[PDB]
Short mmCIF file of C-alpha atoms and ligand atoms in Angstrom, two decimals:
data_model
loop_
_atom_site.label_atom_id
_atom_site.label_comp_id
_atom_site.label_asym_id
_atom_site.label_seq_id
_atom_site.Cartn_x
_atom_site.Cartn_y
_atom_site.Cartn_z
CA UNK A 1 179.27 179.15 70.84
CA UNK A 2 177.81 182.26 69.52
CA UNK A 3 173.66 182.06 68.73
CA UNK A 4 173.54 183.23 65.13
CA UNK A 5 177.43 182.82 63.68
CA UNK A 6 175.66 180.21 60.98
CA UNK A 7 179.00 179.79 58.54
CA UNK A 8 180.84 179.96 62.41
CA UNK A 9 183.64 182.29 60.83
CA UNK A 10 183.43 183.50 64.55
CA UNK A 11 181.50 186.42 64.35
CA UNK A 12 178.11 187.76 63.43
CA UNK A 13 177.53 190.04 60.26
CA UNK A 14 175.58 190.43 56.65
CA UNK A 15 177.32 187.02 55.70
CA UNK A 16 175.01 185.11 58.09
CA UNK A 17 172.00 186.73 56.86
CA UNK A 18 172.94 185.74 53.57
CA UNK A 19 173.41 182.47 54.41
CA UNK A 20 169.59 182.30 55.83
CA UNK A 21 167.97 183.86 52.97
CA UNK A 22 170.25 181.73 49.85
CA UNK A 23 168.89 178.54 52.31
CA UNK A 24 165.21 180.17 52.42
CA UNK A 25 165.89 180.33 48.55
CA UNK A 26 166.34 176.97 48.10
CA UNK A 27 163.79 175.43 50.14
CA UNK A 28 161.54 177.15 48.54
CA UNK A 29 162.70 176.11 44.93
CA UNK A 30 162.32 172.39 46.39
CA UNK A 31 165.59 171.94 48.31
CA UNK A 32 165.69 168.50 50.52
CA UNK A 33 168.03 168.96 53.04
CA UNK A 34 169.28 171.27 56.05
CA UNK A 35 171.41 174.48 56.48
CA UNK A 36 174.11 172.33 57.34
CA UNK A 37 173.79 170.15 54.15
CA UNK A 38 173.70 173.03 52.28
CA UNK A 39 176.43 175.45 53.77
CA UNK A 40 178.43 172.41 53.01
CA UNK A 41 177.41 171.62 49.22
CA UNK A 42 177.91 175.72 48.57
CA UNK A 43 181.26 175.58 50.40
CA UNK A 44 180.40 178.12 52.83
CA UNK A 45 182.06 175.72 55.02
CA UNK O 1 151.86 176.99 32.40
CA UNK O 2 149.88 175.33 35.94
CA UNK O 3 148.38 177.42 39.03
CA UNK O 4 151.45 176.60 41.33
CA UNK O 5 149.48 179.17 43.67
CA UNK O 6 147.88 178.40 47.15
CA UNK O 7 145.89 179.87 49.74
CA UNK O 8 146.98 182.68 52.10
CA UNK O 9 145.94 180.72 55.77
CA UNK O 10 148.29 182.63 57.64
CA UNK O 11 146.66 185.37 60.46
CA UNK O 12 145.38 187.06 60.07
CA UNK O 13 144.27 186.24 56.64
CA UNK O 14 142.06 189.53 55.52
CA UNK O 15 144.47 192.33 54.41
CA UNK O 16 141.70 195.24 53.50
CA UNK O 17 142.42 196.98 57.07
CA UNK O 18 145.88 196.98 56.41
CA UNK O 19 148.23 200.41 56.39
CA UNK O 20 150.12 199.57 53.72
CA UNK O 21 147.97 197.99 50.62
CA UNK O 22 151.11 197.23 48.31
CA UNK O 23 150.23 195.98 44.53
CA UNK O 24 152.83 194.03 42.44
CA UNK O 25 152.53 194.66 38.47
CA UNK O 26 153.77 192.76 36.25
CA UNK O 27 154.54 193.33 32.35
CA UNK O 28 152.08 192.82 29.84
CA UNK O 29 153.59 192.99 26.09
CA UNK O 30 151.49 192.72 23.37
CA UNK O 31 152.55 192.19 19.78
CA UNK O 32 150.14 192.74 16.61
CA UNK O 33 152.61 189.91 14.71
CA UNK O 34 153.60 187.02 15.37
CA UNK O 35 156.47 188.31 12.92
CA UNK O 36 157.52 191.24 15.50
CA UNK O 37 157.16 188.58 18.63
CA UNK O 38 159.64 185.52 17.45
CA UNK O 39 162.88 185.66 19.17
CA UNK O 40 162.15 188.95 20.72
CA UNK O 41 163.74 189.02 24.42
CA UNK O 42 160.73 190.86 26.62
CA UNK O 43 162.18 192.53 30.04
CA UNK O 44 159.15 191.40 32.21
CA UNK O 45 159.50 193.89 35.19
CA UNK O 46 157.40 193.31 39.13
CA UNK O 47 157.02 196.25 39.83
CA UNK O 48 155.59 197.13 43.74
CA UNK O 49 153.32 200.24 44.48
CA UNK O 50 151.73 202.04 47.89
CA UNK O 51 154.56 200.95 50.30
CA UNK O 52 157.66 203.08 50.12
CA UNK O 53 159.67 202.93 53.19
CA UNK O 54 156.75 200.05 54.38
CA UNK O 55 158.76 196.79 54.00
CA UNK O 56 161.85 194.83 54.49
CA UNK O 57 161.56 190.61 54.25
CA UNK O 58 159.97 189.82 50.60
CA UNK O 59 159.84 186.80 49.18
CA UNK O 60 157.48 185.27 46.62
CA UNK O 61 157.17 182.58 43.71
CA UNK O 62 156.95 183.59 40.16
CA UNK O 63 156.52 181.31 36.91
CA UNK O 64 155.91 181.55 33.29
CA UNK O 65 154.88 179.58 30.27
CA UNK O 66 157.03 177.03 29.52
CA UNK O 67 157.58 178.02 25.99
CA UNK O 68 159.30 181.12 26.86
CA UNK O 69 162.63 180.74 27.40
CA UNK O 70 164.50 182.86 30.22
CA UNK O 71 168.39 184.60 29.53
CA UNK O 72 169.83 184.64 32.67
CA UNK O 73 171.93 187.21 34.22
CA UNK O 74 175.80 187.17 33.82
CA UNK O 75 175.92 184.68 37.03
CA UNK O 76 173.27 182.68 35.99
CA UNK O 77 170.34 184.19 38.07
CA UNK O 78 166.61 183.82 36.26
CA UNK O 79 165.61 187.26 37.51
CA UNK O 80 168.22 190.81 38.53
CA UNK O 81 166.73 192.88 41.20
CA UNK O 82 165.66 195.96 40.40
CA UNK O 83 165.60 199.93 41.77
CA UNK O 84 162.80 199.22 44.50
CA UNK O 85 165.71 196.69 46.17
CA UNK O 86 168.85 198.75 45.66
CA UNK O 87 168.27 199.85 49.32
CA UNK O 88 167.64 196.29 50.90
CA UNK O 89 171.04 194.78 50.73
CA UNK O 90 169.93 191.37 51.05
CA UNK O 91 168.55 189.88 47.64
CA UNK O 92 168.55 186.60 46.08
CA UNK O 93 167.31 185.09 43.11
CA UNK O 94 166.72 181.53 43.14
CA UNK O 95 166.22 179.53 39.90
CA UNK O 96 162.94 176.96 40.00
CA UNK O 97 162.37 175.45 36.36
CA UNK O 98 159.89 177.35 34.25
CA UNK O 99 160.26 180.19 37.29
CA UNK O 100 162.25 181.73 39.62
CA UNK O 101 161.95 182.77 43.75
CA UNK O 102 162.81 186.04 44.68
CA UNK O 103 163.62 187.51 48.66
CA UNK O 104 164.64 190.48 50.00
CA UNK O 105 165.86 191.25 53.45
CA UNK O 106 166.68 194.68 54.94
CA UNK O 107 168.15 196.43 58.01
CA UNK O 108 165.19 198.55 58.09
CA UNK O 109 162.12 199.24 56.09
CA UNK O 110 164.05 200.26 53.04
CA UNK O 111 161.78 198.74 50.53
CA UNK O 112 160.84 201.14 47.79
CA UNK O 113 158.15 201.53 45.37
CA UNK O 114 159.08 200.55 41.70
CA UNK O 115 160.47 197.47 40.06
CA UNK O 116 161.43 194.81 42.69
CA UNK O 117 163.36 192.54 39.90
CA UNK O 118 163.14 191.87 36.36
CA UNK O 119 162.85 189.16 34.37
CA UNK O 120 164.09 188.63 30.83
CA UNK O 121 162.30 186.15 28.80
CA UNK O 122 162.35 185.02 25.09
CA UNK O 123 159.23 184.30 22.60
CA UNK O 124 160.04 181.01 20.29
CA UNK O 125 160.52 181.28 16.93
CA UNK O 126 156.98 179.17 16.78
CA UNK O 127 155.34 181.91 17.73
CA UNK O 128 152.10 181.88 16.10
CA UNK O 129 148.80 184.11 15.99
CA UNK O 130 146.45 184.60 19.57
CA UNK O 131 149.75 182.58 21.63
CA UNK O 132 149.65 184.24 25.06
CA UNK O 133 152.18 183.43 27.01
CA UNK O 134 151.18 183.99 30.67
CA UNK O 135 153.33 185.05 33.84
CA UNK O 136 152.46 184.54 37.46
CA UNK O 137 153.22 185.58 41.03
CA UNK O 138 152.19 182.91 43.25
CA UNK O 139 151.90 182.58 46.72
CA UNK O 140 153.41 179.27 48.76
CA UNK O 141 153.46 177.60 52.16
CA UNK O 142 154.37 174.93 53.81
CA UNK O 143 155.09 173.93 57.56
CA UNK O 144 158.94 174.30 57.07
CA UNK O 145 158.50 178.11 55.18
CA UNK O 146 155.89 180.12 53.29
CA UNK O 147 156.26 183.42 51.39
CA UNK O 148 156.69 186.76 52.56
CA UNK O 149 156.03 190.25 52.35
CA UNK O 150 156.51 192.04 55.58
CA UNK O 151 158.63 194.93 57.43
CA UNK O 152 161.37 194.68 59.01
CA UNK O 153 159.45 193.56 62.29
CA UNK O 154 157.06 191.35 61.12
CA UNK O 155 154.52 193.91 62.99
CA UNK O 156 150.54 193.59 63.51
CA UNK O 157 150.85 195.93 60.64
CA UNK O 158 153.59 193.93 58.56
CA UNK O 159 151.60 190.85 58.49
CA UNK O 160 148.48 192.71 58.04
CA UNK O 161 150.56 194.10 54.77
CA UNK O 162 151.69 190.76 53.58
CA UNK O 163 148.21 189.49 53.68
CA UNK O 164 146.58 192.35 51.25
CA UNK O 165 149.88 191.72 49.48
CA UNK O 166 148.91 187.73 48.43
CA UNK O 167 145.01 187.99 48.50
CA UNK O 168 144.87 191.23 47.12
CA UNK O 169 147.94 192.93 45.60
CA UNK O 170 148.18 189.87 42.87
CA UNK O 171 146.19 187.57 41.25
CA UNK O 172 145.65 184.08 41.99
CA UNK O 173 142.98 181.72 41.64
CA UNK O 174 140.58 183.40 44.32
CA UNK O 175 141.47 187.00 42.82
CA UNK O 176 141.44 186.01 39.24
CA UNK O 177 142.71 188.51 36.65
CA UNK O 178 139.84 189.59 34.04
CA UNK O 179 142.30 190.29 31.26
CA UNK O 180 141.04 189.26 27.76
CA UNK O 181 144.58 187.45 27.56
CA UNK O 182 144.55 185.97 30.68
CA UNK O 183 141.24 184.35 30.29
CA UNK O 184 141.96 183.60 26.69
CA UNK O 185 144.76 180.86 28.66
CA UNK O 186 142.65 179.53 31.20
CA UNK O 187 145.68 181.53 33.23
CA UNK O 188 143.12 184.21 35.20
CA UNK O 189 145.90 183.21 38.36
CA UNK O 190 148.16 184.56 36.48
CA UNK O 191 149.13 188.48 36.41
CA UNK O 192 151.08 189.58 33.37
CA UNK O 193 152.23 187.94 29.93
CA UNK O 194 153.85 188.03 26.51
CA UNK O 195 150.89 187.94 23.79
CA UNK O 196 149.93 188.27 20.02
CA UNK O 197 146.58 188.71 18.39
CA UNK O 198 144.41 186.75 15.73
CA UNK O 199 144.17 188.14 12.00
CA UNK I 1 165.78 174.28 69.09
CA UNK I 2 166.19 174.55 65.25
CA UNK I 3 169.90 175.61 64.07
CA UNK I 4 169.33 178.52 61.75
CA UNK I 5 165.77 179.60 63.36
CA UNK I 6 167.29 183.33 64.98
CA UNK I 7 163.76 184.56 65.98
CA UNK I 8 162.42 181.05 67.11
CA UNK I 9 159.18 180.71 65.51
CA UNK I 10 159.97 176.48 64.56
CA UNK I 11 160.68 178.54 60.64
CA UNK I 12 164.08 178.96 58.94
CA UNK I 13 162.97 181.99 56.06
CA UNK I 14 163.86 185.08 55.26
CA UNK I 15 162.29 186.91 58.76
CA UNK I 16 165.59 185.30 60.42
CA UNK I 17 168.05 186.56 57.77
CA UNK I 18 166.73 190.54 58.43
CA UNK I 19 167.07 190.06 62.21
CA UNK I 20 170.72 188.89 61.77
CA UNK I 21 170.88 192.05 59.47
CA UNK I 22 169.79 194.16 61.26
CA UNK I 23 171.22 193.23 64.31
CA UNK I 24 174.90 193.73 62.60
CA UNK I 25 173.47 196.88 61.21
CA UNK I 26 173.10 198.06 65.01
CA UNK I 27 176.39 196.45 66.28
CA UNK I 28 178.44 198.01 63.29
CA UNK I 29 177.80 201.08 64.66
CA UNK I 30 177.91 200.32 68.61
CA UNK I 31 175.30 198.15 70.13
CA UNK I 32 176.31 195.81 72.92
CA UNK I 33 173.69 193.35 73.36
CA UNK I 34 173.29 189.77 72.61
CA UNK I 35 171.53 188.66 69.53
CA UNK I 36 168.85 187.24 71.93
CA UNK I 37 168.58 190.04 74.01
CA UNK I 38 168.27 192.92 71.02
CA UNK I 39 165.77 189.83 69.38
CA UNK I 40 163.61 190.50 72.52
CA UNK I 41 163.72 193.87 73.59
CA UNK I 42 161.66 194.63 70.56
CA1 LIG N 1 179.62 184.96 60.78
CA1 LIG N 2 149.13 184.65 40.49
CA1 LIG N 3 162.52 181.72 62.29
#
């Protein structure tokens, strides 16, 4: 439900950000694959 | 070392008007030996002037020779962020080969003047006379991202910032360095570097 | 449209990570809007 809980830990805070900029990160190092794929291979959830 | 660099073509795409003309410096060692140079570990520093309190979002490529070898941080990270960052709480080092990408984020424009991050990097032991190892800050898009350098608004004024910062406030190919090191290694897009003299 | 795109520009970088910081650094201390509506009153 809520627009911008990206690890969906129910609420909206610094860990979110964090999220977006460590995906940012990796794109731009050469990372294939979405912020799904990725919250999932770093366990985020 | 390769001109990963591109071309700013975001808008607008001419920085000189800009409020905030912010300059990244980067570390230029020299040693008279190749002697003093071997196995030396060189804290290469990017340091940002002429926008305290001017910028949030940051985010930019860097690279080096690929003869220089880089001690990471105690978690691994290429590059540690530095005093100009210690009020942006959002920071990330991301490793990229013979390189490293480095963001910032803040809740407001807490971006200082000073060194953004550091990098530590190591001369071989084959170090030789006249080597120049040569270390760039490159700019990079694509349609999915591109680098940054803007407040924490992404204003008329913020992008007109982040354009002086990638056409202007480093070197690349279409604002070449002029150093006698830099041209010495066909590396005028680069900005700083380890390097050693002849006899 | 895009899952992780916060300000909606088509673009997942860092721009959306400072607007989700910021907008927690306005909640934290007693803000009331949506994401979307704090995104767009500015
Ligand atoms: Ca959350
Ligand atoms: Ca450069
Ligand atoms: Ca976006």
């Amino acid at each position: 439900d809520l627009f911008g809980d990206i690890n969906g830990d129910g609420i909206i805070d610094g860990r979110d950000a964090t999220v977006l900029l460590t995906y940012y990160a990796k794109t731009s190092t050469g990372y294939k694959g979405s912020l799904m794929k990725f919250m999932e291979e770093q366990n985020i959830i | 070392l390769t001109d990963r660099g591109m071309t700013y073509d975001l808008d607008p795409k001419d920085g000189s008007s800009a409020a905030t003309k912010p300059v990244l410096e980067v570390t230029k060692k020299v040693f008279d030996t190749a002697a003093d140079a071997a196995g030396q570990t060189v804290t290469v520093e990017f340091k940002v002037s002429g926008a305290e309190g001017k910028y949030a979002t940051t985010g930019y490529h860097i690279y080096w020779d690929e003869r220089l070898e880089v001690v990471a941080t105690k978690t691994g990270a290429y590059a540690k962020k530095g005093a100009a960052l210690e009020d942006s709480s959002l920071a990330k080092a991301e490793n990229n080969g013979n390189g490293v990408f480095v963001a910032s984020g803040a809740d407001d424009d807490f971006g200082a003047d000073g060194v953004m991050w550091t990098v530590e990097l190591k001369v071989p032991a084959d170090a030789k006379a006249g080597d120049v190892y040569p270390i760039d800050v490159a700019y990079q898009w694509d349609p999915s991202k591109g680098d940054l350098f803007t407040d924490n608004k992404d204003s008329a004024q913020g992008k007109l910032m982040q354009a002086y910062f990638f056409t202007q406030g480093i070197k690349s190919s279409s604002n070449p360095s002029t150093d006698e090191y830099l041209v010495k290694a066909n590396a005028t897009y680069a900005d700083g570097y380890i390097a050693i003299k002849a006899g």
